[PDB]
Amino acid sequence: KTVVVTTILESPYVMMKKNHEMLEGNERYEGYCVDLAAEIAKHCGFKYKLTIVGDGKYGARDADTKIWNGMVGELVYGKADIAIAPLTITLVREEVIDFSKPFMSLGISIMIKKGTPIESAEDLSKQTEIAYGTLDSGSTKEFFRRSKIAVFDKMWTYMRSAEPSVFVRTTAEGVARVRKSKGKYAYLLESTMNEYIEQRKPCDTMKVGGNLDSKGYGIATPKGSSLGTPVNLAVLKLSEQGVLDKLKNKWWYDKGEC
Amino acid sequence: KTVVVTTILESPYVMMKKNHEMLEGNERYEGYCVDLAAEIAKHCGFKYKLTIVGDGKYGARDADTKIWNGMVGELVYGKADIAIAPLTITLVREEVIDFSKPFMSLGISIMIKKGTPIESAEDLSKQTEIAYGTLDSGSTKEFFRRSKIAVFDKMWTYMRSAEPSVFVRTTAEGVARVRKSKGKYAYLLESTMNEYIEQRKPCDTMKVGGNLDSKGYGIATPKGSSLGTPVNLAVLKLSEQGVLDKLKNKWWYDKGEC
Ligand SMILES: N[C@@H](Cn1cc([N+](=O)[O-])c(=O)[nH]c1=O)C(=O)O
Ligand SMILES: N[C@@H](Cn1cc([N+](=O)[O-])c(=O)[nH]c1=O)C(=O)O
Ligand SMILES: [Zn+2]
Ligand SMILES: [Zn+2]
Ligand SMILES: [Zn+2]
Ligand SMILES: [Zn+2]
């Protein structure tokens, strides 16, 4: 049985290769998670096909219907056997799917156009000249929605009602919005992405302040899947072998252009 | 049934209260892990008894007898129901006990007496004037014994054969050795401990360089135990509701003496 892997186009985790049009199957893709997938499959001994999540979302549960979308939904409804992606380990997800131990740590962070007069989340919350938002479906939005911290709740109150909307469908759209907004939009996004983007041309963005939280990405499987245990053990093995660090260095800093 | 919790006297995770001789049961202890245990218990809905691990050890498998010592052994042999302590999530332990998702991130780091001419593991590995060692049992030592990375193996090769022994029995012993050795002993230890000590009088130590690796502490339960699921969910809930961050700040920095 070939294992169906659900993933998402998000640099430098999974990207189309320069010459992908002349390539087929898994070979079209490169990135940290593409490499992680190959290692996991090697150590657990399976063959697999990478497939990009149809709706291009990470996964949230619809309030009215209670149906899960995104990569999470593909696992929940049996469309994929495993998700190998920058997928945040969260409580609401852990209730419907299984996560391995984390293969990467991260936090929510702030991205600004260079020269923007912002140093912190508190700075953002105390002003109005500069708009700010998050990836409009995923763990970061849910963080602000659920936050009982005054600074973040204040920010959520602003974001939920902002007009026009401050939420974006993809990271690419968020970043483009910072780049074109002349310093009038700051983007809240995961630190790993922020750090990658800061080192790529045109080198006009930067991460400011510390992370707003601490969490991790894990490999996800359907609850009670037989893949859950071997995969978890494979992640810890790769961590202890230094492989996760090697991949991180390969995809972030060896790819710096600034 | 009252849940038996195994833990270890290691500041500031668990410490004897000043008037402990006058107190009983759980009230004898204080620290990050005592606070965490209270929250875990409250969220899972169980009564518990804190007990200090008899042999004062974290957990290793004796190569000869194959017997597990430390907190891991107390779980494997059924002497405790759960371990709430700075216990590192590792592959070999995951094979015999269950771990929650990590409640704290960390890495192996270098502690020096202020003014020691050392900035990194490479620096340490390329010289012999300054001695260096690790806790004589635990995941840090195992990290070096197992590492296939040139620098860390070079360090291990030095450390296993160094005489007198560069290894120490307790964190306290390592720190005292740093402080007394006039810059001629550096101590390799987990970053969280390093960070704690840097804010303690006499304020004569510091963490230098990046971390050598990345990993996490997890709450541990016997394989197959029914506490595993609720406990994991409780960890994620505490992470997301900011409790883990509050606790780290309370015990590391709010008490800061430097
Ligand atoms: N990892 C998240 C998805 N996700 C991704 C990014 N991102 O890649 O910058 C983000 O800023 N916010 C977010 O919730 C999840 O799993 O929902
Ligand atoms: N957390 C470890 C134990 N452990 C603790 C410390 N520490 O408290 O400084 C250390 O420096 N090295 C180590 O292996 C494990 O679980 O074995
Ligand atoms: Zn194309
Ligand atoms: Zn491998
Ligand atoms: Zn005493
Ligand atoms: Zn609570």
From Swiss-Prot, chains A, B:
Record-annotated site: Crucial to convey clamshell closure to channel opening: I118
Annotated site residues (Interaction with the cone snail toxin Con-ikot-ikot) in this chain: R61, R145, K237
Domain of life (superkingdom): Eukaryota
Disulfide bonds: C203-C258
Phosphoserine carried by residues: S147, S181
Inducing factors: Down-regulated in the pyramidal cell layer of CA1 in the hippocampus by global ischemia.
Modification after translation (UniProt): Palmitoylated. Depalmitoylated upon L-glutamate stimulation.
Residues that bind L-glutamate: P86, T88, R93, S139, T140, E190
Expression sites by tissue: Detected in forebrain. Detected in dendrites of neuronal cells. Expressed in the pyramidal cell layers of CA1 and CA3 and in the granule cell layer of the dentate gyrus.
Extracellular topological domain residue ranges: 117-258
Protein's cellular compartments: Cell membrane; Postsynaptic cell membrane; Postsynaptic density membrane
Comment block on domains: The M4 transmembrane segment mediates tetramerization and is required for cell surface expression.
Family membership noted in the UniProt record: Belongs to the glutamate-gated ion channel (TC 1.A.10.1) family. GRIA2 subfamily.
Note: The postsynaptic actions of L-glutamate are mediated by a variety of receptors that are named according to their selective agonists. This receptor binds AMPA (quisqualate) > L-glutamate > kainate.
Subunit record text: Homotetramer or heterotetramer of pore-forming glutamate receptor subunits. Tetramers may be formed by the dimerization of dimers. May interact with MPP4. Forms a ternary complex with GRIP1 and CSPG4. Interacts with ATAD1 in an ATP-dependent manner. ATAD1-catalyzed ATP hydrolysis disrupts binding to ATAD1 and to GRIP1 and leads to AMPAR complex disassembly. Interacts with GRIP2. Interacts with GRIP1. Interacts with NSF via its C-terminus. Interacts with CACNG2, PICK1 and GRIP2. Interacts with GRIA1 and SYNDIG1. Part of a complex containing GRIA2, NSF and NAPA and/or NAPB.
Biological role: Ionotropic glutamate receptor that functions as a ligand-gated cation channel, gated by L-glutamate and glutamatergic agonists such as alpha-amino-3-hydroxy-5-methyl-4-isoxazolepropionic acid (AMPA), quisqualic acid, and kainic acid. L-glutamate acts as an excitatory neurotransmitter at many synapses in the central nervous system and plays an important role in fast excitatory synaptic transmission.
Protein name as it appears in the record: Glutamate receptor 2
Taxonomy of the source species: Eukaryota, Metazoa, Chordata, Craniata, Vertebrata
Gene coding for it: Gria2
